[PDB]
Design a protein around this motif. Structure first.
Motif, PDB file in Angstrom:
ATOM      1  N   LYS A  66      18.295 -12.894  -9.462  1.00 21.89           N
ATOM      2  CA  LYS A  66      19.322 -11.932  -9.061  1.00 21.89           C
ATOM      3  C   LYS A  66      20.176 -11.515 -10.250  1.00 21.89           C
ATOM      4  CE  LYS A  66      23.126 -11.356  -5.852  1.00 21.89           C
ATOM      5  NZ  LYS A  66      24.110 -11.973  -4.903  1.00 21.89           N
ATOM      6  N   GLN A  87      20.407  -7.852 -12.284  1.00 21.24           N
ATOM      7  CA  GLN A  87      21.690  -7.193 -12.545  1.00 21.24           C
ATOM      8  C   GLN A  87      21.762  -6.737 -13.996  1.00 21.24           C
ATOM      9  OE1 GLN A  87      25.303  -9.247 -11.266  1.00 21.24           O
ATOM     10  NE2 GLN A  87      24.038 -10.299  -9.744  1.00 21.24           N
ATOM     11  N   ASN A 110      19.401  -3.862 -14.870  1.00 21.76           N
ATOM     12  CA  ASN A 110      19.857  -2.583 -14.330  1.00 21.76           C
ATOM     13  C   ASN A 110      20.644  -1.773 -15.363  1.00 21.76           C
ATOM     14  OD1 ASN A 110      20.323  -0.733 -12.092  1.00 21.76           O
ATOM     15  ND2 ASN A 110      22.464  -1.399 -12.228  1.00 21.76           N
TER      16      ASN A 110
END
Ligand SMILES: CCn1cnc2c1c(=O)[nH]c(=O)n2C[C@H]1CC[C@H](CNS(=O)(=O)c2ccc(OC3CCOCC3)c(F)c2)CC1
Length: 127
Positions: free
Chosen positions: A114, A118, A121
């Protein structure tokens, strides 16, 4: 049983490159994940003997770990960001393949993944 040799981190026959995306992967992404309190099981190749992980290398034929990724980035081993991202994804996938769903190591990998997503991105455009 015996462990396999670790993945290579440099190869004098493979072209080497530094790009700003790869520098971000080393300076931002890897550094962020490395210090996470869940990162330690992922910082070095699985020692299946010492971890008593039965059949690890019968099941996992493309091992990968963050220590390998870190050294590959430091040695300019990757030609592009996709190759580096693939190694992170292989590390996470190996954990999900070998271990039972809901095992602590799987939840640890999911947390790291996760955070990884992030940081990816915000990968910069190539300079
Ligand atoms: C990746 C290659 N590799 C390396 N060691 C491997 C593996 C492999 O593929 N499978 C393996 O089995 N091992 C052995 C394990 C032994 C146990 C070790 C965790 N122990 S811990 O750091 O004390 C700890 C942390 C977090 C905990 O709970 C939170 C609660 C909510 O979210 C997340 C879990 C918790 F209860 C206990 C994790 C590696």
């Amino acid at each position: 049983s015996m462990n396999p040799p670790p993945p290579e981190t440099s190869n004098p026959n493979k072209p080497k490159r530094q790009t700003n995306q790869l520098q971000y992967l080393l300076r931002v992404v890897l550094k962020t994940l490395w210090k996470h309190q869940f990162a330690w099981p992922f910082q070095q190749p699985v020692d299946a003997v010492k971890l008593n992980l039965p059949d690890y290398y019968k099941i996992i034929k493309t091992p990968m770990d963050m220590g390998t990724i870190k050294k590959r980035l430091e040695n300019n081993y990757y030609w592009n960001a996709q190759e580096c991202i693939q190694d992170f994804n292989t590390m996470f996938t190996n954990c999900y393949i070998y271990n039972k769903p809901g095992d602590d190591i799987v939840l640890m990998a999911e947390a790291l993944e996760k955070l990884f997503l992030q940081k990816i991105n915000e990968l910069p455009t190539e300079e």
